Write a protein that binds this DNA or RNA. Structure first.
Length: 530
RNA sequence: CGCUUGCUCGGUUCGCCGAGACUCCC
């Protein structure tokens, strides 16, 4: 019930003394990565006893012989080794869950056919994790507002903690024609009355005008003789949008132990325990809480990605159905074409990656579907007198023709011919297809962007659903009831249809289900999964 | 009543405007 969640807040970095690679705090954290990511499985159990104690840290470096490059400090050296231990442990934990996926799928796969009819030899983990030089800051180096008097005096700005920060622009309509920032004469009567986030700079008009944004709210982080400054404007967006809204008061909301990503160029702050009043929860099968309560039955219909029978329920009544607006479906349809255009384009390159001998099998399982069906004719002994289009799910006419032959009489077994001679991709080639395809999906800029947009649209749909439920059902408690996707219609009579798959689905099926389940943790909205 | 940076998708003879997400990381 108490708020036990801490969302992230991202912060832009202005300037650095010297690159973070040369910092001693990170440099020691690289010697705790060559060793802790290369020792055998038996060795890890031997070296896991080093913790908050002062003498315990310095004793390890005597044994492991990892050079402590001047970074002799406690309360900041534990975070150097805890995350490497967790990352080392997390990799093994990841393989255990992966094996469960194979094991669980193995039971279903054999039953479906039945009804029809990573440490290696050395002990060190293979594919060992990379060096992440993110600097894990700590409370003793808690960021503070910049002051030109005591700091390096970098030329950006100054800070008045007692006085509030300045508004973006006052009286946007009042600015003359020459000074940027006023509403033009052709755009006057189309202004929003809502409380949207007012923006000033990035419209790509003079986006390169670096003196623009810099003319700023600086806060400083200094480890030893190495310092860095960033922008509190990032903190300001979060404090305003989230509704929790003095620079010290702004820094007081967030934590003094952020993460300094060198490559990303962004620092990641974490809220305090009570800064965001959201309780991370877990899906409940039933009887979550007797506790009116607004209940939404998210049905993932084929026609519309979301469909919701709003119902007002009470302890010891349908309110109608509202699905989605035209514009949002248009955006999803816009993304449908956006996501599709990349997939076959990326998937086409997968065949290019696959060797000439290994790409040959893919041609058979796809283009030759009928060719293997031509063999199916010979094995079943069926003739051409029975047209392919004549068949439907009621395919007993084959059995009648099969009984006419009688050589093979696989009809009396335990039941629920299509799958029995249906070929499948060879395992050795399969593992080449998926991995290579994965390699490009993690190396293509477009796909990573679309994955971000996929999730943003996922929350857009759940935001619309909860907002409508709060409005249409007039309730404060939103109890979401999604359908379990662990085990999930068209009837074209042609044989080709049986080969054709993907019933206009699986675009957002996995995405809304994980997104809706995330509302239990990220927002604390109950999710009664069933 | 109530939002300066970063990011997503929109309209514009270019001033600017309409909307969206924010639990992150490996």
């Amino acid at each position: 019930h108490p708020a036990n969640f801490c969302p992230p807040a991202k912060v832009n970095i202005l300037a650095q003394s010297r690159p973070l690679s040369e910092w001693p705090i990170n440099l020691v954290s690289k010697g705790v990565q060559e060793y802790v990511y290369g020792l055998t499985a038996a060795e890890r159990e031997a070296n896991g006893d080093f913790g908050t104690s002062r003498k315990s840290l310095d004793r390890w470096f005597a044994r492991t012989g990892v050079p402590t490059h001047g970074y002799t400090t406690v309360q900041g050296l534990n975070l150097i080794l805890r995350h490497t231990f967790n990352r080392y442990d997390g990799v093994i934990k990841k393989v255990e869950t992966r094996n469960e996926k194979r094991r669980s799928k193995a039971t279903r796969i054999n039953v479906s056919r039945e009804a029809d009819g990573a440490f290696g030899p050395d002990g060190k983990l293979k594919e060992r994790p990379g060096i992440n030089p993110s600097i894990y800051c700590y409370q003793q180096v808690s960021p503070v507002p910049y002051n030109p008097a005591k700091h390096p005096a970098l030329p950006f700005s100054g800070v008045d903690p007692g006085a509030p920060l300045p508004l973006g622009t006052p009286n946007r309509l009042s600015i003359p024609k020459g000074q940027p920032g006023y509403v033009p004469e052709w755009q006057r009567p189309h202004l929003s009355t809502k409380n949207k986030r007012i923006r000033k700079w990035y419209a790509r008009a003079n986006w390169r005008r670096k003196p623009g944004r810099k003319s700023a709210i600086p806060i400083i982080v200094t480890i030893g003789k190495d310092w860095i400054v960033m922008d509190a404007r990032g903190l300001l967006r979060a404090v305003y949008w989230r509704g929790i809204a003095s620079l010290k008061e702004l820094l007081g909301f967030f934590s003094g132990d952020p993460v300094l990503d060198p490559k990303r160029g962004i620092a990641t702050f974490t809220f305090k325990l009570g800064a965001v009043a959201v309780h991370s929860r877990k899906p409940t099968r039933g009887k979550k809480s007797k506790e009116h309560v607004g209940l939404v039955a998210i049905d993932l219909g084929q026609t519309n990605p979301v469909a919701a029978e709003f119902s007002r329920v009470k302890r010891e009544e349908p309110l109608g159905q509202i699905v989605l607006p035209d514009d949002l479906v248009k955006d999803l349809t816009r993304y449908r074409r956006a996501w599709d255009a990349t997939e076959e384009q990326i998937k086409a390159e997968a065949i290019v990656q696959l060797p000439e001998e290994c790409r040959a099998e893919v041609v058979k399982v796809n283009q030759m579907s009928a060719e293997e069906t031509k063999h199916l004719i010979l094995d079943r002994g069926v003739s051409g007198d029975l047209p392919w289009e004549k068949m439907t799910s009621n395919t007993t006419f084959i059995s009648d023709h099969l009984l006419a032959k009688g050589v093979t009489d696989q009809v009396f077994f335990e039941k629920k011919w299509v799958k029995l001679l249906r070929p499948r991709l060879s395992q050795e080639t399969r593992k080449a297809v998926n991995d290579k395809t994965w390699e490009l999906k993690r190396a293509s800029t477009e796909y990573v962007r679309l994955s971000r947009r996929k999730t943003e649209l996922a929350r857009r749909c759940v935001n619309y659903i909860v907002r409508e439920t709060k409005r249409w059902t007039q309730c404060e408690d939103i109890a979401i009831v999604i359908e379990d996707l662990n085990v999930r219609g068209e009837r074209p009579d042609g044989w080709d249809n049986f080969f054709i798959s993907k019933r206009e689905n699986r675009w957002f099926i996995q995405v809304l289900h994980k997104a809706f389940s995330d509302l239990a943790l990220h927002r604390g909205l109950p999710v009664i999964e069933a």
